[PDB]
Design a protein around this ligand. Sequence first.
Ligand SMILES: [Mg+2]
Ligand SMILES: [Mg+2]
Ligand SMILES: [Mg+2]
Ligand SMILES: [Mg+2]
Ligand SMILES: [Mg+2]
Ligand SMILES: [Mg+2]
Ligand SMILES: [Mg+2]
Ligand SMILES: [Mg+2]
Ligand SMILES: [Mg+2]
Ligand SMILES: [Mg+2]
Ligand SMILES: [Mg+2]
Ligand SMILES: [Mg+2]
Ligand SMILES: [Mg+2]
Ligand SMILES: [Mg+2]
Ligand SMILES: [Mg+2]
Ligand SMILES: [Mg+2]
Ligand SMILES: [Mg+2]
Ligand SMILES: [Mg+2]
Ligand SMILES: [Mg+2]
Ligand SMILES: [Mg+2]
Ligand SMILES: [Mg+2]
Ligand SMILES: [Mg+2]
Ligand SMILES: [Mg+2]
Ligand SMILES: [Mg+2]
Ligand SMILES: [Mg+2]
Ligand SMILES: [Mg+2]
Ligand SMILES: [Mg+2]
Ligand SMILES: [Mg+2]
Ligand SMILES: [Mg+2]
Ligand SMILES: [Mg+2]
Ligand SMILES: [Mg+2]
Ligand SMILES: [Mg+2]
Ligand SMILES: [Mg+2]
Ligand SMILES: [Mg+2]
Ligand SMILES: [Mg+2]
Ligand SMILES: [Mg+2]
Ligand SMILES: [Mg+2]
Ligand SMILES: [Mg+2]
Ligand SMILES: [Mg+2]
Ligand SMILES: [Mg+2]
Ligand SMILES: [Mg+2]
Ligand SMILES: [Mg+2]
Ligand SMILES: [Mg+2]
Ligand SMILES: [Mg+2]
Ligand SMILES: [Mg+2]
Ligand SMILES: [Mg+2]
Ligand SMILES: [Mg+2]
Ligand SMILES: [Mg+2]
Ligand SMILES: [Mg+2]
Ligand SMILES: [Mg+2]
Ligand SMILES: [Mg+2]
Ligand SMILES: [Mg+2]
Ligand SMILES: [Mg+2]
Ligand SMILES: [Mg+2]
Ligand SMILES: [Mg+2]
Ligand SMILES: [Mg+2]
Ligand SMILES: [Mg+2]
Ligand SMILES: [Mg+2]
Ligand SMILES: [Mg+2]
Ligand SMILES: [Mg+2]
Ligand SMILES: [Mg+2]
Ligand SMILES: [Mg+2]
Ligand SMILES: [Mg+2]
Ligand SMILES: [Mg+2]
Ligand SMILES: [Mg+2]
Ligand SMILES: [Mg+2]
Ligand SMILES: [Mg+2]
Ligand SMILES: [Mg+2]
Ligand SMILES: [Mg+2]
Ligand SMILES: [Mg+2]
Ligand SMILES: [Mg+2]
Ligand SMILES: [Mg+2]
Ligand SMILES: [Mg+2]
Ligand SMILES: [Mg+2]
Lengths: 77, 175, 111, 141
Amino acid sequence: STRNGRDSQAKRLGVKRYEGQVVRAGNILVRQRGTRFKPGKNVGMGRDFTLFALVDGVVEFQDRGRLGRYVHVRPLA
Amino acid sequence: MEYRLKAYYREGEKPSALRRAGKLPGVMYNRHLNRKVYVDLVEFDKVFRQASIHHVIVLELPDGQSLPTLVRQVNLDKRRRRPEHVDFFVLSDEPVEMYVPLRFVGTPAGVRAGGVLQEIHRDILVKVSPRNIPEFIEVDVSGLEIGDSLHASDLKLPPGVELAVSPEETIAAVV
Amino acid sequence: ARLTAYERRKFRVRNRIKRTGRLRLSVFRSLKHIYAQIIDDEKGVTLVSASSLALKLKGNKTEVARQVGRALAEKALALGIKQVAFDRGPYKYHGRVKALAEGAREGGLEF
Amino acid sequence: MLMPRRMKYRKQQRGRLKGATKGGDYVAFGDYGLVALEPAWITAQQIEAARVAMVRHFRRGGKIFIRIFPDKPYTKKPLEVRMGKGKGNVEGYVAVVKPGRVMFEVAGVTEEQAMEALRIAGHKLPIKTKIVRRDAYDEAQ
RNA sequence: AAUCCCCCGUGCCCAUAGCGGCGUGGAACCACCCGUUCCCAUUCCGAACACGGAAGUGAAACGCGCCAGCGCCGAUGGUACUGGGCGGGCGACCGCCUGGGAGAGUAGGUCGGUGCGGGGGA
RNA sequence: CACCUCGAUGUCGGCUCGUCGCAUCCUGGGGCUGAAGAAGGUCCCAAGGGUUGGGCUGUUCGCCCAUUAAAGCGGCACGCG
RNA sequence: GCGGUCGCCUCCUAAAAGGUAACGGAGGCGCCCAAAGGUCCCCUCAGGCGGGACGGAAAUCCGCCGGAGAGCGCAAGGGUA
RNA sequence: GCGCUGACUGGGGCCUGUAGAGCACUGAUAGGGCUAGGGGGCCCACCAGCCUACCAAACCCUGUCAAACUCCGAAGGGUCCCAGGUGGAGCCUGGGAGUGAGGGCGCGAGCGAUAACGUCCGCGUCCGAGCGCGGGAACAACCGAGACCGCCAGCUAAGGCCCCCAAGUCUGGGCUAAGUGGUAAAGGAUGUGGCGCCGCGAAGACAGCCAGGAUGUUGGCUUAGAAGCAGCCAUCAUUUAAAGAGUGCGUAAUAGCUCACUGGUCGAGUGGCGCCGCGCCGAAAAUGAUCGGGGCUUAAGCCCAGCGCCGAAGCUGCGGGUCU
RNA sequence: GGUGGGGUUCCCGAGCGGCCAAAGGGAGCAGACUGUAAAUCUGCCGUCAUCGACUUCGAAGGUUCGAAUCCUUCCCCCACCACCA
Ligand SMILES: [Mg+2]
Ligand SMILES: [Mg+2]
Ligand SMILES: [Mg+2]
Ligand SMILES: [Mg+2]
Ligand SMILES: [Mg+2]
Ligand SMILES: [Mg+2]
Ligand SMILES: [Mg+2]
Ligand SMILES: [Mg+2]
Ligand SMILES: [Mg+2]
Ligand SMILES: [Mg+2]
Ligand SMILES: [Mg+2]
Ligand SMILES: [Mg+2]
Ligand SMILES: [Mg+2]
Ligand SMILES: [Mg+2]
Ligand SMILES: [Mg+2]
Ligand SMILES: [Mg+2]
Ligand SMILES: [Mg+2]
Ligand SMILES: [Mg+2]
Ligand SMILES: [Mg+2]
Ligand SMILES: [Mg+2]
Ligand SMILES: [Mg+2]
Ligand SMILES: [Mg+2]
Ligand SMILES: [Mg+2]
Ligand SMILES: [Mg+2]
Ligand SMILES: [Mg+2]
Ligand SMILES: [Mg+2]
Ligand SMILES: [Mg+2]
Ligand SMILES: [Mg+2]
Ligand SMILES: [Mg+2]
Ligand SMILES: [Mg+2]
Ligand SMILES: [Mg+2]
Ligand SMILES: [Mg+2]
Ligand SMILES: [Mg+2]
Ligand SMILES: [Mg+2]
Ligand SMILES: [Mg+2]
Ligand SMILES: [Mg+2]
Ligand SMILES: [Mg+2]
Ligand SMILES: [Mg+2]
Ligand SMILES: [Mg+2]
Ligand SMILES: [Mg+2]
Ligand SMILES: [Mg+2]
Ligand SMILES: [Mg+2]
Ligand SMILES: [Mg+2]
Ligand SMILES: [Mg+2]
Ligand SMILES: [Mg+2]
Ligand SMILES: [Mg+2]
Ligand SMILES: [Mg+2]
Ligand SMILES: [Mg+2]
Ligand SMILES: [Mg+2]
Ligand SMILES: [Mg+2]
Ligand SMILES: [Mg+2]
Ligand SMILES: [Mg+2]
Ligand SMILES: [Mg+2]
Ligand SMILES: [Mg+2]
Ligand SMILES: [Mg+2]
Ligand SMILES: [Mg+2]
Ligand SMILES: [Mg+2]
Ligand SMILES: [Mg+2]
Ligand SMILES: [Mg+2]
Ligand SMILES: [Mg+2]
Ligand SMILES: [Mg+2]
Ligand SMILES: [Mg+2]
Ligand SMILES: [Mg+2]
Ligand SMILES: [Mg+2]
Ligand SMILES: [Mg+2]
Ligand SMILES: [Mg+2]
Ligand SMILES: [Mg+2]
Ligand SMILES: [Mg+2]
Ligand SMILES: [Mg+2]
Ligand SMILES: [Mg+2]
Ligand SMILES: [Mg+2]
Ligand SMILES: [Mg+2]
Ligand SMILES: [Mg+2]
Ligand SMILES: [Mg+2]
């Protein structure tokens, strides 16, 4: 017999809205494990590091080098 | 001493077809130039056997010129180990790095009957001007006894130029 | 030694500010003088400046400071500006910086 | 018998034999070499059957370089087969060898002497080979 | 007002701005510096943080330059691979078409650029 | 492995009756021999025919007795209820 | 049947969204902390080298170099000066 | 009911960490150098202590490997926007189901043995339900192609065009002599055709034939004798266009014989290597054989280029049916 | 027949790849003890020879620089496997 045999549930992680999608206040934007997308303008980040639109708007991505990747919501939806 | 081959020009004409044609694709470049060239394969082999990035190939090619090219890469395709592309580096006078063969001249030179010859490098990398190009390098070193290791400045350093360093290294020793 | 306590604590106190997204009232106190800008980030642009250098005053820098404080309100409040966030940068909020701050009232408020 | 000391995982997946490639391939250490014509898992007990064929031909003389190494664990099910329960039971190790790679590669021996040794050495191998010499094409580096 | 150059802030690009070596700056800014009464301080120490200063020095720090030993960036050609279409081999696997096309490596490149506001020069 | 057969494809061994294969046990023909002869060894050709009787065990097989040119090995639903 | 297993977390398998199987490869949980919690204020590692009584490979001290390889209560991953 | 939103496609953004590759991390890892620790061999036993043809840290040169490594990273894939797209498309509400044993094949993996008409997933397809049609001898799932009905009409697909058997004994060019085709591998071979590379050669080579076939000498060693051929070696030296103290037969050791190596004869090629095409060996199983069969050899086989024709329930032509 | 483990000087016996002619015990020879012995203690323990030289691990051959120690091979053992329904 085998002492192996487990695995855990898929956590269905990753990005839930991409650039230039129209979001709404509260929409969550990224589901993620560490801080690998840091919150930008109008983007909150919850205790599971999870990012959500603060305002209705549209989503843009920004790659700031050693500063990291950033998700902003650009208002006036 | 002087290696002339040939060359030609190309723009379109898939290298698959050329290669199928007996002609070895390649490129021609230096600081001032980049150009697509091909050569005959059989022609190139006979020269490159000899030349081998140690010596200057003067090309030629149509609109006949003579370009002081060093060959700086050969890409062989691994399956058949036959060269599938060459790129020729054209000289003009600025100090430039390259590989100069070594000549070990002498007897075992110390601890004879018997030592260990033990050549570490068959070549060396040296920053050298196009004008004076040292086609080989004399290594005598009467000893070379047990426990001695030749580094860099213990080498001839032909009147042309200096090294590509680092001066601390090993070339021959006897253990 | 990479990236000193100075420049950490500096970032640490700055980054928090730049989050709330107000106008930033930045404060540079030197050994002689004390200067203050009011900056709009995302336009990357200074709006209203004040200093002991440009107002050519001296006499006891904590008192000088409060003066470049009242000086900044004045100039700034004039453009519509109210509600900023007080930088304080590397400085403990104390002394000369506390004073430019607590003289930066009558406009540019909540500190 | 070659075999890694201190493995990180015993038992790794089989994976494919595709794409003759990836280094080795140019004869860096010696005067002559054995190059792989076809892909194979080549077994530690195969490599040493080649090594010894050659040292025997040099009468303990010469220099021999090997240059493939069996780091891939080979499992087997005891006899007693039945599919399941687990995976089980590493026998040997193999090195994966795709075409154009140099294994072995002698030096410090007369040409016809080494060429006879490499030919022997080759018969101990499951795939086809090619004997090679060394070249301008094997560059400098 | 503008244009320029130098400094002080403060952003942006996020190493082509970095390490190292050399050189250079004190009028002004900045630093070190002079003190520890006072505010306020260091699990001990005004080191730091803080205040009051202004004699000195640009030694340290910083700013500005220069050098390619390192670091970093890096083609063009050519391959690998491959979306779609076809073949071949007992097999492991291979090949052709059409479109896309790396990685390493070669040539090279670089000792930053730039915005807003100050202070000073013209 | 689980593909036809569980609304049934009777299962070992023996006996009877064979037929086929040849990787040949014997007989026939060969090469080599570390083949003097005789007698072997090994390998090649060859499936025409042959290929014993007993003790023990349900046995196949094996061991053993006495012989023999030899006491062949397989397949045919481990051939054939 | 016997053996193993049965819910939860981490990684790989998984074919660069998600998801994805096998008695496929490996590991972990069934707790814990009144501070290991909120906030404000400071502080920045491991490691290497040189120095220094009892001090040793490493107790504490000083110098320089060290961009994170340390730490984050526990498995792994992601994250993080 | 809504009614242009659909699959698919164009452009644009964003997301990702696989193929490939890489070694910067985690490990593995070949050769070398330089070096802590050390096996030690030992110099002393006080710190000492020189060498490594063993381990082996770090470090540097060279060289690799990895599902649970990644400094890199394609093609693709996903999602939103804007456009095309009127489709037995799409969305919303409801009524009725059936299904929840799948299978083969391709591709990508795992398990297995780089076994299975094996097993387990992924993406695709077909069978299922297209065991209706054509091709593949026959044959669910391979190639062709989606059968509404009728016709003694046409064009094609796949595959075919010597006869069984509809259409070429078609036209060029080349290869193979095995009946290969009508196959099974390592490996082997003056098979045969081609493209090379190297050596030697009219200072006349390769082949034969004519001629010479050392001497100190038994070489010493061993020896009744090895005086090359019972044999372990110093295989050295001379004179020569030139014979190895000698390769084999011989052998009472010798005698005798041959070879090597040269001279001459003659007269144009010769020997080595690598590559490609087709073939040969390797090649033994059980009721009677066979490529489907006859039969085929400048092909009726294989490669290259052509031109025609045959060929389905596909397509067309004519008539008809039903639904929309 | 097939795979698990075993052969150590005359006997039992320990054995790391750098030491292994191989320590540890009994034999077995020599000395001392004793009137002489047995027991006990001492030295010798394959051969010489000063050290050290030299072959021994059942026989052989490999691997390694080095093998009693790894690798097969011919034996030589008792723990185990071979119909079948
Ligand atoms: Mg998971
Ligand atoms: Mg390869
Ligand atoms: Mg082989
Ligand atoms: Mg001054
Ligand atoms: Mg001065
Ligand atoms: Mg006081
Ligand atoms: Mg204190
Ligand atoms: Mg200075
Ligand atoms: Mg690059
Ligand atoms: Mg490119
Ligand atoms: Mg493609
Ligand atoms: Mg590139
Ligand atoms: Mg700036
Ligand atoms: Mg069944
Ligand atoms: Mg099944
Ligand atoms: Mg039944
Ligand atoms: Mg029935
Ligand atoms: Mg019945
Ligand atoms: Mg026969
Ligand atoms: Mg006979
Ligand atoms: Mg006879
Ligand atoms: Mg005979
Ligand atoms: Mg017969
Ligand atoms: Mg009776
Ligand atoms: Mg009976
Ligand atoms: Mg029996
Ligand atoms: Mg009988
Ligand atoms: Mg029978
Ligand atoms: Mg049976
Ligand atoms: Mg039966
Ligand atoms: Mg009956
Ligand atoms: Mg149970
Ligand atoms: Mg995924
Ligand atoms: Mg996917
Ligand atoms: Mg568990
Ligand atoms: Mg430290
Ligand atoms: Mg220390
Ligand atoms: Mg960490
Ligand atoms: Mg539309
Ligand atoms: Mg759409
Ligand atoms: Mg699109
Ligand atoms: Mg890979
Ligand atoms: Mg690595
Ligand atoms: Mg990977
Ligand atoms: Mg890149
Ligand atoms: Mg897109
Ligand atoms: Mg639309
Ligand atoms: Mg529908
Ligand atoms: Mg419904
Ligand atoms: Mg099911
Ligand atoms: Mg299906
Ligand atoms: Mg299924
Ligand atoms: Mg295919
Ligand atoms: Mg199946
Ligand atoms: Mg299968
Ligand atoms: Mg399917
Ligand atoms: Mg059904
Ligand atoms: Mg069908
Ligand atoms: Mg269908
Ligand atoms: Mg049928
Ligand atoms: Mg048919
Ligand atoms: Mg229809
Ligand atoms: Mg056709
Ligand atoms: Mg026909
Ligand atoms: Mg006809
Ligand atoms: Mg004809
Ligand atoms: Mg035939
Ligand atoms: Mg045939
Ligand atoms: Mg013809
Ligand atoms: Mg027609
Ligand atoms: Mg129709
Ligand atoms: Mg009609
Ligand atoms: Mg209808
Ligand atoms: Mg007495």
